[PDB]
Write a protein that binds this ligand. Structure first.
Ligand SMILES: [K+]
Ligand SMILES: [K+]
Ligand SMILES: [K+]
Ligand SMILES: [K+]
Lengths: 325, 325, 325, 325
């Protein structure tokens, strides 16, 4: 607590930086698969756009040597640079530094070898920012929990869908441009339009045609106007739909598990059903029918605070409600 | 209270009008996407229908200024007729007033501008009166609290495919009639029948083809004889099936939460399942291997009568059954 | 009772009759859509089969004034041959009586009017037997409940898509043979085999093609080799893929609800693994660990057999339990 | 005890053997449908592989007479090697010895009789070792037994589609090679590769094509470039997707119960959501929220998982903890 070259992690200049690299760790998570797939090296008018975005991430390298890490079991904020600067190199230092090398200038420098461009798939470790942003959005008791817990599983299931549409076009560009009729896009004809010589089509027609055959597959609709033709594309859509089957079952299971043990206000309307169904099975004279649901509304609005709340309560809370009521 | 200018909210001469406005709001929210998508301005018939579809809502928009409101906080009836007109002008006035302007004559008497027809979507706020019909049916006690959340959810799921079937046809008409072979309907050939010059086919063939696509996409069957061809129909199908993927898991999540607290055909087969871990684990007489299982057949729906709901609730009903026997 | 002109409801020679018309109730409710759709009047080789099948449902309509029942109030046997004839004649008499008429040649001996062959669709009220067989099986503890709850929903779901496969070919026979190219089967070509002049095709090829369509629609696969061509087949599959969309979300719901309320072994696994979960946060003794997991290895069965059903055993039944123990 | 012949069942040299035939019970389970579907007798290259794979199961069938079994009602490890003759010959002996003969050599030199090769399916009883591997992984308390039924039901859901992928190719070869255009592969054309004369394509192209069909059917995607054309392939696809529907519902039903049974951050929001409902009715201090919500992690798992899991435990460890303090 006596260092002062140390930011404790709720500053109004650090919370306004932590959300500044979340519109870069979203952009560099989306531009990275369609930088790998749709471009064999970036064009020259993106030279200014790709040198930034990596210039705002090595600012983040030096700036996380100075933030106060709150420990797990110690439950106190640690303030010494010796204790944060070693957990940084232990946990996340290679992930965020080897991705900050310019891999578009290296690829054009090395005689255009193809395998050096696979070292920009390590920029997909910047999805940590978005999943952490969704992670302490569950720990915010203001927003509907069923709204956020399904937005985390609808960020993942569409980001994986976006990535397995750039890989699916990359597997079409790996064949030469004379075995071009033996691929999923070079043999495509939609309406009165033919996708011949698909390296010259506009980027967004190629990207939309690729993403349509990942969202139609992800939703398990599968029209079959676009389908796999090669053998590597068959293997890729075997790997993809097998993982997407589990990813889709772990959304029904994640919605059901929040509806089943859902709102107790729905359970009150549920638990008056058997009351009415046994007062009206063997008919009782119509006397209390509204006063009972009013009294049980006032009861179950206080039944959780009758016994159930205050076995877990600490001292110096309940006496206030006890004196005020 | 001391007012005469207002109407009691449980009048059976007012709730015989809320059923009339219900079957007007059901009609003019199904026809409204059919007026948007399938017509560029209504024909010379359906004009008197277009004006009597709105002078049935003008009567309701002048009637709700004189209805009694039950307060949200104090749970009291608010009779005085300026705390309701201040309330009605704030919550529902301007999306119900601008849905009663004649947006077909305003379109045709303005030089036929296309963008003024997009104000025909504010008439889709009249599904308020259909979704509240399902909300005051849940708070009914006569039928299930969740079956009116299954018949409600199947209304919402099917209504969004009637709307998507009209937007999907509308996107085919935004292309010029000479480039019709690059659409989903202009390049269609189902059987020996070619769907060319598709603005001169009968209206019901066009609507049935579009609804056939939207419904076999909603159920995620997706045969593929009708698919997206443009880059705008690709984007629309990509938007639609993602929202449909979340709307189709909510149905399953509600049906599970209905079933998990059902009847004794799944509880009794846990009761005798736990009995047979004492009635067959510790060996028991075959004479008594009929007696208690016949008894636990005889208690549920007859002698059980949900005893805890007559245990925790006070004993005026017990005084009534003391008067019984 | 002193009547003796009534068969008792439980019997040796009567329960071997109800599982003899149970074979005729799974025959004559599976041959009935195949006789409506694929035939227009049975041929002469199938004459004696449609006569002997309807007299077995005629010696059974007279064998219901000779049987007792169990009313839900007295819950005893009600031997009186005039009470039963005013309950049988109310509920099950018309639907069980006019389905025994010889509808095959009543069609043939009335000038072959097609609308009189729609009155053999009420021979599908014979599936009362095949559903009371499955709702009798669920009150039987010889077999597990997870097998007789997912097979009642696999009888229903396969039977409805057997019916929707004969209706789907019937809608192709309602066009003339000069417009057979505008149907789903006359405009079919699977491989190098073309289904031209489909009335002159062997019955089982037509039935297998139609049922293969309806089964790959039921599972929501939907290949698209067989699709709806007309405007009346689109309407049928629009009804059908939206009915079985709820019928197949009701099956997932049952399989889920019969898993989340697991047996004793599942709760045993759960509570012992969450017992060992908090063990290695303190890391106590090794023989202590094994000894207390032995304590809760024998503290699952008789400890939680005993405490559960002692909440409900009636009087004079616990007494000989305590006497034997 | 006195017997020195037999292996003690928790040997260290019998846990490097049952993990040695678990890659021969995965090899001989994946290769046997590929030996049955894709060949007519093995080539003379693949000879010593078959012989080694069969001899390292003979060496196991004479090694399980030499072992003791844990009793399940007496719970003693039975060392007596005269009752190991029993519990093996009314157990897996004939389905370890009949499926151990050289069934390719019997087929190749007896006359090329096709029905002899159907006895290779006895070798699919060696999946019992792989399914008993997971059933010995359920009992490991150091891993969640609900996330050992998500890969157990995913091996089952992907082994049954590797097998179906070979039966689907086998039904294409039961037709003569001149009537190959009436198959699913002899009438296939993908891009510009016509799959004609399909017995001379190399093995991995045929296997990748058949597994591609079976896996996009298993996920219920179903593009429809590869569909059934025959009547045998139609009946097989009908049988396969009906099993697959129940298995896919069973996967969701098993995933759901994993999420319903507790989640700690979700349980923090299972309590905070109703705790604030009381607080906005009986309005406490707005500056007392920090006192309330801070202790909903302070005694979660520091008093919730500690003593509430311990009221079924004696205080012999509580004395150790109290002297620890
Ligand atoms: K499909
Ligand atoms: K398809
Ligand atoms: K599907
Ligand atoms: K599908």
């Amino acid at each position: 607590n006596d260092y002062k070259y140390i930011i404790h992690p709720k500053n109004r200049w650090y919370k306004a930086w932590e959300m500044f690299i979340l519109v870069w760790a979203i952009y560099s998570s989306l531009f990275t698969p369609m930088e790998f797939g749709f471009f064999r090296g970036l064009p020259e008018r993106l030279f200014v756009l790709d040198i930034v975005g990596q210039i705002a991430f090595l600012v983040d390298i030096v700036l996380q040597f100075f933030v106060a890490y709150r420990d797990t079991q110690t439950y106190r904020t640690v303030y010494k640079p010796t204790r944060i600067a070693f957990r940084y190199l232990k946990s996340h230092f290679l992930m965020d530094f080897i991705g900050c090398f310019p891999w578009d200038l290296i690829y054009k420098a090395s005689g255009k070898h193809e395998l050096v461009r696979y070292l920009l798939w390590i920029r997909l470790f910047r999805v940590r920012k978005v999943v952490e942003f969704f992670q302490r959005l569950e720990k915010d008791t203001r927003i509907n929990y069923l709204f956020t817990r399904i937005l985390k599983l609808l960020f993942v299931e569409v980001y994986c869908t976006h990535t397995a549409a750039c890989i699916f076009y990359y597997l079409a560009t790996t064949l030469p441009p004379e075995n071009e009729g033996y691929t999923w896009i070079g043999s495509l004809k939609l309406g009165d339009y033919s996708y011949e010589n698909f390296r010259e089509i506009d980027l967004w027609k190629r990207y939309t045609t690729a993403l349509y055959f990942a969202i139609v597959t992800m939703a398990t609709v599968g029209y079959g106007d676009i389908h796999a033709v090669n053998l590597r594309e068959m293997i890729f859509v075997m790997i993809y739909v097998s993982f997407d089957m589990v990813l889709g079952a772990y959304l029904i299971g994640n919605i059901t598990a929040l509806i089943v043990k859902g709102s107790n206000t729905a359970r009150f309307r549920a638990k008056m059903n058997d009351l009415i169904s046994f007062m009206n099975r063997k008919k009782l004279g119509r006397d209390l029918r509204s006063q009972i649901t009013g009294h049980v509304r006032l009861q179950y609005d206080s039944h959780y605070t009758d016994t159930v709340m205050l076995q877990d309560i600490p001292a110096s809370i309940r006496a206030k409600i006890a004196q005020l009521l």
